[model samples]
Target chain A: GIVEQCCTSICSLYQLENYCN
Target chain B: FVNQHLCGSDLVEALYLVCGERGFFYTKPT
Candidate 1:
């Protein structure tokens, strides 16, 4: 699955610090 | 235990209304 990468991992934080300006 | 553990779900259908217009809230009211 790593050829084109069938899966990827992304984690998120609860703080909306960098969310909006 | 990962159901596409990325960004949170989109909250499309939602609303925050007032009942008798507050001074308090519709608790679990404490």
Candidate 2:
């Protein structure tokens, strides 16, 4: 369940960074 | 470090795609 717990935040990173750029 | 391969719009979509992937384990008999 770590993925589910963490993915929201992890996915949010992309929502801001737009994928490492 | 995780699914870094996914880049572009298609790649961005996979973030959600993976959520769906993870969702499967919850619904599947275990």
Candidate 3:
């Protein structure tokens, strides 16, 4: 789950919202 | 197509390292 968490955080931090979902 | 084998702190550190290398923390859009 940490990878998912990192992905979410990274996506948000980079404004890559589409990558989160 | 993301790699599914990575997880936990490994993935966390990997992401952070990449972002840090790219200066994402400093250049991120506000």
Candidate 4:
């Protein structure tokens, strides 16, 4: 299930970058 | 094959943890 949605695509970098600030 | 496309029923629960104790999260259903 972890590889079904968010984890399937490439976007963690953006999310983390945006939120870390 | 549109009908043969890849799909799945799943979601993600992300929590923004702050101070290592407080946090929030949301879920997106598919």
Candidate 5:
């Protein structure tokens, strides 16, 4: 499930960046 | 099965584009 975790992390980072900047 | 059925390349591509627009550099994994 590493890839899944990575995907979720990337998605979360993308969302956070999107919200912040 | 990482990039096969789990997450479509298109989704990643879209994310790349979006991230790029936001000034973040994102590249597809090799």
Candidate 6:
């Protein structure tokens, strides 16, 4: 579902920024 | 030093806590 995708996107963003730092 | 990384972690209950340090009262509080 799109809601799940949204959650995934948010998590991915956190994961992305996580790796950068 | 704490809260320096917005993306920080500590293992808790088998899952990682990715926290918002803005909510962290103070780095020195603990």
Best by lDDT: 5
Write the number of the candidate with greater lDDT, choosing between 4 and 5: 5
Best by DockQ: 3
Model 6 clashing residue pairs (backbone) = none
Candidate 6 lDDT over residue span A1-21, tens digit each: 222332333333343223221
Q: Please tell me which model should have the higher TM-score, number 5 or number 6.
A: 5
lDDT per residue (tens digit) for residues B1-30 in model 1: 223333222110100111123222111211
What's the DockQ for every one of the candidates? 0.07, 0.07, 0.14, 0.12, 0.12, 0.03
- Give Cα distance to truth, residue A10, candidate 3, Å: 18
Question: Which lDDT tens digits does candidate 6 get at residues B1-30?
Answer: 132222223211111233343222112111
Chain A of model 3 scored by TM-score: 0.27
Q: Comparing candidate 4 with candidate 6, which one achieves the higher TM-score?
A: 4
| lDDT leaderboard ranking | 5, 3, 2, 4, 6, 1
Docking class of 3: incorrect
TM per candidate, chain B: 0.15, 0.29, 0.42, 0.17, 0.37, 0.14
Name the regions of candidate 1 deviating beyond 4 angstroms: A1-8, A14-16, B1-4, B8-30
Error of 4 at A2 (Å): 11
Contacts from the true interface found in each model, as a fraction, amount to 0.11, 0.00, 0.09, 0.02, 0.02, 0.00
For candidate 1 chain B, which ten residues in a row score worst on lDDT? B10-19
- What's the TM-score of each model vs. the native? 0.19, 0.24, 0.32, 0.22, 0.27, 0.17
Instruction: Identify the leading candidate in terms of TM-score.
Output: 3
How close to the true structure is residue A18 of candidate 3, measured as C-alpha lDDT?
25
**Higher-ranked by lDDT: 3 or 4:** 3
Pairs clashing within candidate 5: none
Q: Tell the DockQ for candidate 1.
A: 0.07
